[PDB]
Design an enzyme around this catalytic site. Structure first.
Site, PDB file in Angstrom:
ATOM      1  N   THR A 274       0.831  -1.200   0.000  1.00 17.40           N
ATOM      2  CA  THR A 274       0.000   0.000   0.000  1.00 17.40           C
ATOM      3  C   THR A 274       0.867   1.253   0.000  1.00 17.40           C
ATOM      4  O   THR A 274       0.665   2.165  -0.809  1.00 17.40           O
ATOM      5  CB  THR A 274      -0.938  -0.005   1.210  1.00 17.40           C
ATOM      6  OG1 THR A 274      -1.832  -1.122   1.126  1.00 17.40           O
ATOM      7  CG2 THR A 274      -1.753   1.277   1.274  1.00 17.40           C
ATOM      8  N   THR A 275       1.848   1.312   0.905  1.00 18.18           N
ATOM      9  CA  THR A 275       2.718   2.480   0.983  1.00 18.18           C
ATOM     10  C   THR A 275       3.409   2.746  -0.344  1.00 18.18           C
ATOM     11  O   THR A 275       3.636   3.908  -0.704  1.00 18.18           O
ATOM     12  CB  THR A 275       3.755   2.287   2.092  1.00 18.18           C
ATOM     13  OG1 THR A 275       3.089   2.007   3.330  1.00 18.18           O
ATOM     14  CG2 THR A 275       4.619   3.536   2.250  1.00 18.18           C
TER      15      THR A 275
ATOM     16  N   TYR B 299      -0.626 -10.851   3.036  1.00 19.88           N
ATOM     17  CA  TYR B 299      -0.789  -9.421   3.289  1.00 19.88           C
ATOM     18  C   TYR B 299      -2.252  -9.230   3.676  1.00 19.88           C
ATOM     19  O   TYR B 299      -3.135  -9.220   2.814  1.00 19.88           O
ATOM     20  CB  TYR B 299      -0.402  -8.594   2.066  1.00 19.88           C
ATOM     21  CG  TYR B 299      -0.403  -7.090   2.286  1.00 19.88           C
ATOM     22  CD1 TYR B 299      -0.613  -6.547   3.545  1.00 19.88           C
ATOM     23  CD2 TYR B 299      -0.200  -6.216   1.223  1.00 19.88           C
ATOM     24  CE1 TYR B 299      -0.618  -5.184   3.742  1.00 19.88           C
ATOM     25  CE2 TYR B 299      -0.204  -4.849   1.413  1.00 19.88           C
ATOM     26  CZ  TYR B 299      -0.414  -4.340   2.676  1.00 19.88           C
ATOM     27  OH  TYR B 299      -0.420  -2.979   2.883  1.00 19.88           O
TER      28      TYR B 299
ATOM     29  N   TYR C 187      -5.181  -7.007   5.154  1.00 15.32           N
ATOM     30  CA  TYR C 187      -5.515  -5.587   5.275  1.00 15.32           C
ATOM     31  C   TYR C 187      -7.020  -5.430   5.084  1.00 15.32           C
ATOM     32  O   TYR C 187      -7.491  -4.989   4.032  1.00 15.32           O
ATOM     33  CB  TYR C 187      -4.741  -4.766   4.243  1.00 15.32           C
ATOM     34  CG  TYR C 187      -4.635  -3.282   4.520  1.00 15.32           C
ATOM     35  CD1 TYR C 187      -5.394  -2.670   5.508  1.00 15.32           C
ATOM     36  CD2 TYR C 187      -3.768  -2.489   3.779  1.00 15.32           C
ATOM     37  CE1 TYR C 187      -5.289  -1.314   5.750  1.00 15.32           C
ATOM     38  CE2 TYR C 187      -3.658  -1.137   4.013  1.00 15.32           C
ATOM     39  CZ  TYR C 187      -4.417  -0.553   4.997  1.00 15.32           C
ATOM     40  OH  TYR C 187      -4.294   0.800   5.218  1.00 15.32           O
TER      41      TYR C 187
ATOM     42  N   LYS D 129       1.600 -10.126   7.347  1.00 17.13           N
ATOM     43  CA  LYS D 129       1.562  -8.724   7.753  1.00 17.13           C
ATOM     44  C   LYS D 129       0.103  -8.374   8.013  1.00 17.13           C
ATOM     45  O   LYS D 129      -0.713  -8.375   7.086  1.00 17.13           O
ATOM     46  CB  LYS D 129       2.157  -7.820   6.680  1.00 17.13           C
ATOM     47  CG  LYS D 129       2.088  -6.336   7.014  1.00 17.13           C
ATOM     48  CD  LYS D 129       2.376  -5.475   5.790  1.00 17.13           C
ATOM     49  CE  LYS D 129       2.046  -4.013   6.051  1.00 17.13           C
ATOM     50  NZ  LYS D 129       1.996  -3.196   4.801  1.00 17.13           N
ATOM     51  N   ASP D 130      -0.223  -8.074   9.266  1.00 12.77           N
ATOM     52  CA  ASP D 130      -1.604  -7.859   9.698  1.00 12.77           C
ATOM     53  C   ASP D 130      -1.790  -6.371   9.974  1.00 12.77           C
ATOM     54  O   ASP D 130      -1.370  -5.866  11.019  1.00 12.77           O
ATOM     55  CB  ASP D 130      -1.920  -8.717  10.924  1.00 12.77           C
ATOM     56  CG  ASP D 130      -3.357  -8.567  11.402  1.00 12.77           C
ATOM     57  OD1 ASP D 130      -4.280  -8.570  10.560  1.00 12.77           O
ATOM     58  OD2 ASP D 130      -3.564  -8.472  12.628  1.00 12.77           O
TER      59      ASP D 130
END
Ligand SMILES: O=C(O)C(=O)C[C@@H](O)[C@@H](O)CO
Ligand SMILES: O=C(O)C(=O)C[C@@H](O)[C@@H](O)CO
Ligand SMILES: O=C(O)C(=O)C[C@@H](O)[C@@H](O)CO
Ligand SMILES: O=C(O)C(=O)C[C@@H](O)[C@@H](O)CO
Lengths: 293, 293, 293, 293
Positions: free
Chosen positions: D42-43, D129, D131, D154-155
């Protein structure tokens, strides 16, 4: 860090507070190492209690310990202000109030006034009982600082960022977590502990998790946290508020009577089937010698 | 279709129900075309009232009209049961109850038993008061059928499909909406009316909007509906539960006293601004001759 | 009021747009009385389509009808601006864009700029495609007026108050509803109709509901709405986007190929079990003679 | 535990990936103690990138470090499959993918098949991932076990219990958190690190916070964590996806170009104010000697 118990309210079959069973329970709790007792919280059906019953709970637990925080909130300010003032003759830790519940979308000005009003009249430290789900609104760390008289706070929420933000804007403030699943994580991150419903029926476990995490034994503390998590989940099957009675009787020996409808008790069948899913958990707690057979 | 007022509770400066001011308000609402009266709802601060006081509201309004829906809900079951029973000596429309509030994640079993209980004791038609946001649980079309003793429902929710679905699964149930902003829409789509907070201070409008749409003048109904939408929005500035007291005095010309803290009255300063917000709206309604000069 | 079809995008087994099946489908739709065709919407997997494929859909449907609204939004503004400009050579109703999706909590200034940018370059009317759930943000009637260039709007939401508020602040603006379950209610309340995914496979039904509600035959229109509701619900069992293909083939004869993974097709078993729950519905639609055997 | 940068994508004024500025940024992050690099998150505006461009990001960063997690997700399955496969010639940590975004209410079956698919083709460890907010669906601890081929996760979520539960059900899975505000908390509670948006512009801090808490100086870790919390908050003023570009230039001293519209850059005016917001914070970090003069 501490472990506080939002103590159950035992009711008789005719729906009267069982002062005597409540005392036996408070003793076991203080005996087993609970730091304070949080009275008239959600777990003891506070909002279901009349101003005179909220006071009963105080007077009956004060025969046992003065490590009490006394919840007084309701939808009648004159009632709460009275309860705040009558606590003066009790040498206890403080009084507490959840935000006025039910009515959605109250103004920030009207909520700040409700809390400041109780500080103006309180004869003891004032703790904030922030429970956004139950009450419909959230007194976050910013509004907590705006009100500016909270000795501490129980933050009943799954977001631990929210909880830590109290200690960020209110450094002097005590910050407890209302979630039982974050006992190991709260102890290890530098907040002042947990208010644990689950300590009503497994105070042994809630204290040992606190101790392991205090000892920087986090891999071990998580072992025991995840076990406690499985019990929190089993009690959820049949209504946790009603299952909290069954699980205190199963793990601690004494029974606590009945809840107050519409928080209906479990029937003999729901009680059996719940015991059936914590037998295995009770066993491993015995094999780890956290529990006496 | 019908317009039903969730009638305000006037309180004395001593936090006491003003039975005489309430009687005045009931009379006026009925004279201006309100079909029935919903007593002890959210708008009337039911959850802030005791059983004794919920009963006081019944006896006081029953002195003027018997077109009453008697709300009797609470977190003590015995209290609701006693209220339900005592209504037997009154010729009223029905009794109602919201789902037990505050406590999150109550079991569908516990919920259904709460309502079926009130049915087994009720001496009158039982209406469901469905308000997910305030109570914290939804009694949808399916659970209403499952309970299966509701003559009607008041559905306070943004999702109007939700509302239509009570009629889908319960083809014989009266389905009202809790929205002031859908008086015209409800009427036109074959639903049975609106329990409108705003009919407290503008009954003429709420009834006219319904009228126009039922005369098939839907474009005129929206034109007036959109005017009522601005009164709803303005009231929300200072908390609309408290602003109803100020708006009824402005539009209907009589005093309704104070609300009950933590539902705080508006002060001279807030009351002044709110009237400025609705100055023009009063003018458009007086021109259109919906209001007397 | 109108019925618009967010037309499915038929894909071949090698995952290429089936221009020829798409045409046969557009013809059946216009044939059966659909007013316009909304291209590259959610129902046709718009966000799954490359800028060149979004244009394919336009060029293939423009061989059939010029009653097209052309969705061009993405996460690349230069791509959208191109698609906006290339539509100049197409005599069609307008272009559309949903708010930039995925990225949560974008600023109101950055969203207003995205839409205004597309108005500055568009050679056709600009419709707003407001879908708060899919996109993560809501261009409500206030921000729609702030942007100030929207000929119309498809409001994909369950709250009909939200939708009506477009017509309140933007009186000149066309206001369609994206919900298939509010076709009867939208027609009767004075909004400009519905964009109906369900009209891909039951255009007969969506048009007849519109007509009955237009005829102020609301009790009848609800009869047929609730039936369409039961099909919307059956398609939900296996992923509605993937079931929309099966249900167009079952009700309209021709097949539309495949969807685009991760929107996986239904297998032969899911297809059978879905047909098994609409057989009864297809029958009553035949007995009501809305469908030809 | 580890600190992982979801590395920004620099774009040219012509909306083109600036491969040389990205290489500079990768080098610097690695020199300052970043463990791995999360590419196309996202970043980094992954959902705004094409497969060709997602691949460009890999080859460009692989020129400097091979500590890479290669994100390859999209709404076209074949594209993700091809990206996953082409990673075979690279010595990287793993490939990752968010759940297919936009489309609401995708079936657990369709979801699980999407991920299991990427596993069957992956030549590297597969990281989840997760999200929920951005993608619109949650791949919780249970569904992760069900899929059962994730080396880690990655939560990105406020509920830290959610995060801990991956470790509860998958005792061997790496569990990272997507929160910059829990770098100290994660480290201390036995989770495996943080994928921090803020490590793009303050790697020194994100790594130091982790360091201190792992040296058991938790009170010093919170003291610096709370400072980082103010940088996170300030960036959110003008949309933090765009503010990262301005903050990296300020703190790390090199230009990263522009983001990709509709992710709009800040202008001279907004950039000026944001730096004022973080002027003091830079000073406290330079005093504490976390930053070079
Ligand atoms: O008892 C309280 O009020 C406290 C603990 C919370 O976790 C409680 O909300 C559990 O139901
Ligand atoms: O007040 C009530 O009891 C009812 C009327 C609804 O419109 C209101 O609940 C909305 O808040
Ligand atoms: O196709 C569209 O984009 C429109 C109709 C909506 O109801 C759609 O969201 C259904 O999935
Ligand atoms: O950017 C990513 O891909 C990741 C890092 C998270 O902290 C971020 O997603 C929060 O929004």
């Amino acid at each position: 860090p501490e472990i506080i118990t939002p103590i159950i309210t035992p009711f008789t079959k005719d729906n009267r507070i069982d002062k005597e069973k409540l005392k036996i329970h408070a003793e076991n709790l203080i005996r087993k190492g609970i730091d304070k007792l949080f009275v008239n919280g959600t777990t003891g059906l506070g909002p279901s209690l009349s101003p005179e019953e909220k006071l009963e709970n105080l007077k009956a637990v004060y025969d046992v310990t003065n490590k009490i925080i006394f919840q007084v909130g309701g939808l009648n300010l004159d009632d709460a202000i009275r309860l705040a003032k009558l606590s003066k003759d009790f040498d206890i830790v403080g009084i507490a109030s959840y935000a006025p519940y039910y009515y959605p979308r109250m103004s920030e000005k009207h909520l700040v006034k409700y809390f400041k009003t109780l500080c103006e009249v309180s004869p003891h430290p004032v703790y904030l009982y922030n429970y956004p789900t139950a009450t419909g609104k959230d007194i976050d760390a910013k509004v907590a600082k705006e009100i500016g008289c909270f000795t501490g706070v129980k933050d009943v929420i799954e977001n631990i960022i929210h909880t830590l933000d109290y200690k960020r804007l209110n450094p002097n403030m005590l910050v407890y977590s209302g979630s039982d699943m974050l006992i190991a994580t709260v102890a290890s991150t530098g907040l002042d502990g947990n208010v644990a419903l689950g300590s009503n029926y497994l105070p042994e476990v809630t204290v040992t998790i606190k101790k392991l995490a205090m000892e920087r034994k986090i891999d071990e503390a998580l072992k025991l946290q995840f076990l406690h998590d499985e019990v929190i989940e089993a009690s959820r099957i049949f209504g946790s508020l009603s299952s909290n009675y069954v699980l205190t009787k199963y793990f601690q020996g004494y029974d606590l009577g009945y809840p107050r409808p519409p928080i209906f008790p479990l029937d003999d069948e729901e009680e059996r089937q719940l015991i059936k899913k914590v037998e295995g958990i009770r066993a491993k707690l015995v094999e780890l010698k956290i529990l006496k057979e």
